[PDB]
């Protein structure tokens, strides 16, 4: 009864590896590194939509809420995923955005988002420090889909609530599996959700940053693909004004 | 378009 | 006292990601897929030498034994590593040799080593089935360095024996950590070493195959880089004649 | 050469 019920689906629908298409022969300029990150984002977003569609229960939400939750959570989802890829592939020494777009310190400085990169590297190192297992990683990630909503609620709020709880309960089955002592599960859950909450202020600093960059992007030779431009121009101001907020597991 | 992919 | 003693070093010296340099615009021919795998091998071998040098205790072996153990174990080491990369990056759906050289079923058929690929895919799926943690993976891998030697022994046999045991004992600290029940450690160790032993017959089928291919490689347009050619022409016949054999954890 | 890399 703490054998997982969505875990096999989570493994079968995990997206594969997406390349940025970055030409590594080129200078580490701000224009070149950001153009590739935005391109990598647009490509990842196609994967996130197809994954979210296949996620158990997601297609029960109102079609509009499907759209709102993908639009508000994509940043945290892709940040958390990259952290994990950074940890598995290079042991957190660098931000492994894609195999053809790996950020060392020099790229972190040239991207003009050095302190945000440092924060991502730290999140990446937690996977090592907390010994996050690959099963815990896939259930934690699905939780991040359900972790940011309008202050006023969605069309079918009570349904979103119910799905969120089912993902909290699945992460709990994955915890309780290889643990025998009654109290140990809630202690592991607490360390895991502290980790999920520290994704939220990173995703907020990256929202501010990409919004600020999109409205000046012509001035600095940074290319935003159309889907990304659209979601950021309309949706991100809602997150910046506090119309849309994260659901924290703990007071902050 | 987001909306076309969701479809 | 079951806090790991080489684990932090194992994390710090883990090699990063190595590309094959395969031109994916090209046909899945036997000549093109094998030329890239041999190229990927030569590149990986530079990483394996630098890793093995940095591994605690390895540089205490006679310099000649250093050479013999790298020369006999490289196949199992690179097979096991790929399995893990296949599991973390694509969930075992494909053999993730390098980011620019990923084998789907069609490449497995065109490489003329379809049954050996199936066996690697299976080993990859065990990382999922046995829920191998990333810490267990790095200590299991170091064990594979110490798992094939001449029947007659090496120059400093008793020293190799002592280092092997220290790596068995480190994998045991990583097991015993998050386990409270006395009997559970040896049961996990047993499942882990069964897994390490199933690397040995795969590495032997790939030794036969690459030896058979190297001596006809001019006939079939397959390029072997010089270091690889050298190790395979001289060393692999010693493994095929039974002068050099695996150390099995269990009777076979 | 293996040997040169080991050195
Ligand atoms: C989500 C992405 C792209 C995918 C990824 O691995 C994480 C990464 C985190 C920073 C994002 C980037 C997409 C493009 C953004 C939003 C840039 O405009 C600024 C910061 C970037
Ligand atoms: C070790 C390599 C190359 C590195 C790797 O990820 C595993 C893989 C397993 C099969 C090997 C290949 C190197 C070249 C070989 C030896 C070919 O000649 C035939 C099978 C290949
Ligand atoms: Cl416990
Ligand atoms: Cl236990
Ligand atoms: Zn419990
Ligand atoms: Zn024990």
Author numbering:
A (entry chain A), C (entry chain A): 668 to 919
B (entry chain G), D (entry chain G): 62 to 68
Give the published text:
The androgen receptor (AR/NR3C4) belongs to the steroid receptor subfamily of nuclear receptors (NRs), which also includes the glucocorticoid receptor (GR/NR3C1), mineralocorticoid receptor (MR/NR3C2), progesterone receptor (PR/NR3C3) and oestrogen receptors α and β (ERα/NR3A1; ERβ/NR3A2). The AR, in particular, is critically important for normal development and homeostasis of male and female reproductive organs and their physiology. Structurally, the AR is similar to other NRs consisting of an N-terminal domain, followed by an almost strictly conserved DNA-binding domain (DBD), an interdomain linker or hinge, and a C-terminal ligand-binding domain (LBD). The LBD contains the internal ligand-binding pocket (LBP) and two major solvent-exposed surfaces responsible for interaction with coregulators, activation function 2 (AF-2) and binding function 3 (BF-3)891011 and Supplementary References.
Here we present the crystal structure of the human AR-LBD homodimer bound to its natural agonist, dihydrotestosterone (DHT) and provide in addition strong evidence for its crucial role in receptor functioning. A synthetic UBA3 peptide comprising this motif, S59TESLQFLLDTCKV72 (S59-V72), was found by surface plasmon resonance (SPR) to bind with high affinity to liganded AR-LBD (KD=30.6±0.7 nM). Crystals of AR-LBD grown in the presence of this peptide diffracted X-rays up to a resolution of 2.15 Å, which allowed solution and refinement of the structure of the complex. Electron densities in and around coactivator binding AF-2 grooves could be safely interpreted as corresponding to residues S62-T69 of the UBA3 peptide. These residues adopt an α-helical conformation with the side chains of Leu residues L63 and L67 inserted into the AF-2 pockets of the AR-LBD, similar to the structures documented before for other LxxLL peptide motifs. All AR-LBD structures deposited in the Protein Data Bank (PDB) to date belong to the same crystal form (orthorhombic space group P212121), and feature a monomer in the asymmetric unit (ASU)20212223 and Supplementary References. In contrast, the current AR-LBD crystal structure belongs to the monoclinic space group (C2) and presents four independent, helically arranged LBD molecules in the ASU (details of the final electron density map are shown in Fig. 1c,d). Two of these LBD monomers form a symmetrical ‘core dimer' upon burial of ≈1,000 Å2 of solvent-exposed surface from each molecule, while two peripheral AR-LBDs associate more loosely to the BF-3 grooves of each of these monomers. Core dimer: the two monomers in the AR-LBD core dimer are arranged ‘head-to-head' around a local pseudo twofold axis with both AF-2 pockets facing opposite directions and separated by over 60 Å. The protein–protein interface is centred on residues from helix H5 and the L5-S1 loops of both partners, with additional contributions made by residues from H1 and H7-H9, L1–3, and β-strand S1.
